[PDB]
Amino acid sequence: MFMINILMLIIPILLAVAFLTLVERKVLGYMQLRKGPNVVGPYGLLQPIADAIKLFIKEPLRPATSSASMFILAPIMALGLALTMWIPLPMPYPLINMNLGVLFMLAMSSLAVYSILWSGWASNSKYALIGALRAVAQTISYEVTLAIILLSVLLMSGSFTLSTLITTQEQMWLILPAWPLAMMWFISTLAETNRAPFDLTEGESELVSGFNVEYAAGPFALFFMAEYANIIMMNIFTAILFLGTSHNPHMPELYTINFTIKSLLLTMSFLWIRASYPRFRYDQLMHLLWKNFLPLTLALCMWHVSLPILTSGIPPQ
């Protein structure tokens, strides 16, 4: 019954991306002083099952001046790596016990930009031709802001597995000994996964130009779908790394209860940022990576090399 476990993980998470689109706007609504989806629910709660069927009735045109084998291959690789990344992730037991899987996250988070380079090219001209070339350019630069300060906690964890990442945090909630790194951990995933303040990707992006600009609601229904699957997955990855919960072997039930409550709270912030701050005007977006983000990340890197040595506090492996 291994095969019944995989389907027990793909299917209960497509609701949690469909029941996030509804909480996308109720939370964003009470900031504007207005109620949620009022009339169809009764409380809203039945909105996405009606808002899903309309997309698969509405005619999925292909553009006449488009290519063929590239345009319908990027949504295959969209949902592939958006759902494959959920595998090696402990809660409290992962589906797969990888020896080194923290690196496998970057082995999965690297290839997502190789679909945007397809879809911007595969269909058509200037509103996604050059306008998607400068969306690959922002997402490549925020790995070296990411991969360094992901390594900067592993000097304190001890190894590459994720079971040690819960063992080392039984008494600490490790956001305290590394709180400068925890800041730039947030803004990276806030800009890499193509969200609201650093937003030259989706729809705020000259407010007209996106990679969604050409997909009718047949193939478009996944792009949005798949994408919303990253944003609840960097949140499930931050809260297993910094803000780690407590594991008890005799009681694994109380792990997940105290766990899903925490990833939901960080997921609120991606909604709660969008209702405050304006955009970044593509220069100043990348003007603060090199000049401003990056030299501090090397500074704390040299700090986290020497401090396990000159404390005589080497982590065991």
């Binding site: 964003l28 504007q32 407010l207 007209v208 969008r274 209702a275 405050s276 304006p278 955009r279 005007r281």
Partner: protein, 269 residues
């Protein structure tokens, strides 16, 4: 789409990344206006000045009625002048709500649009109670105001206008000491020379950059000399310090309203 919601087609031969050449095209809404007023009378062709802006309602028809009273040799009566100021300085809390919100929606801030229009609907109420209608009111005539305002509006402007300075105390904390919006707007579009007067500019994108002058206290309109207020100026010559006129004029328009409730003589209209 909405760079002004579907108008203004412009061509840009952009020099690599910079623009260096920009030449727009108007005429997508032309309608034949000035041809068509020749075939009407004076009173009958008045509601095509109200539709000549969008959002100024009583500020237009203030400059048509005043341009026909001159030709007639007639002044308006004294109560008809303290009505026009109570409206002509309440549309300056509508044209400045829009210029500080839809600007900051094109940039991308969501809420101060919604945070102000929820409050703005307390003020399209006030047109309906006096004229009869929602936006375009045919109210001002070339002989003063049409008809008298009902029993009320002085316990309802006063409840409103005593509580507007907190709502304008929210945008100061949204925008002014904000860093990202200051970064989006400093030293951008600095046209400040006497080519910024050779082009024949009117106010702000003048006085917000240098030259102190406006036609409200160097010429008269009305009984409008009998109020006291100051005219905000800008220091440097960019957008962030012609932004700050529009935030600061809205505080000074509350002063000209509170000075107008005390002074209205009873009489004719």
């Amino acid at each position: 789409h909405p760079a002004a919601h579907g108008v203004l087609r412009l061509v840009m031969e952009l020099s690599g990344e910079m623009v260096r050449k920009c030449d727009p095209h108007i005429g997508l809404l032309h309608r034949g206006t000035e041809k068509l007023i020749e075939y009407k009378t004076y009173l009958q062709a008045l509601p095509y000045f109200d539709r000549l802006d969008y959002v100024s309602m009583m500020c237009n028809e203030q400059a048509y009625s005043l341009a026909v009273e001159k030709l007639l040799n007639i002044q308006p009566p004294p109560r008809a002048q303290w009505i026009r100021v109570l409206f002509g300085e309440i549309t300056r809390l509508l044209n400045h709500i829009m210029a500080v919100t839809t600007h900051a929606l094109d940039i991308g801030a969501m809420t101060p649009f919604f945070w102000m229009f929820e409050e703005r609907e307390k003020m399209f109420e006030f047109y309906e109670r006096v004229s009869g209608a929602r936006m375009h009111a045919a109210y001002v005539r070339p002989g003063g105001v049409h008809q008298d305002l009902p029993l009320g509006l002085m316990d309802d402007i006063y409840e409103f206008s005593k509580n507007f300075s907190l709502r304008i105390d929210e945008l100061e904390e949204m925008l002014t000491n904000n860093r990202i919006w200051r970064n989006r707007t400093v030293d951008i579009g600095i046209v400040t020379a006497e080519d910024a007067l050779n082009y024949g500019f009117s106010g702000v994108m003048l006085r917000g950059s240098g030259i102190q002058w406006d036609l409200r206290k160097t010429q008269p309109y009305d009984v409008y000399d009998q109020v006291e207020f100051d005219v905000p100026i800008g220091s440097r010559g960019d957008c962030y310090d012609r932004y700050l006129c529009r935030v600061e004029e809205m505080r000074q328009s509350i002063r000209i309203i509170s000075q107008c409730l005390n002074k209205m003589p009873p009489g004719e209209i």
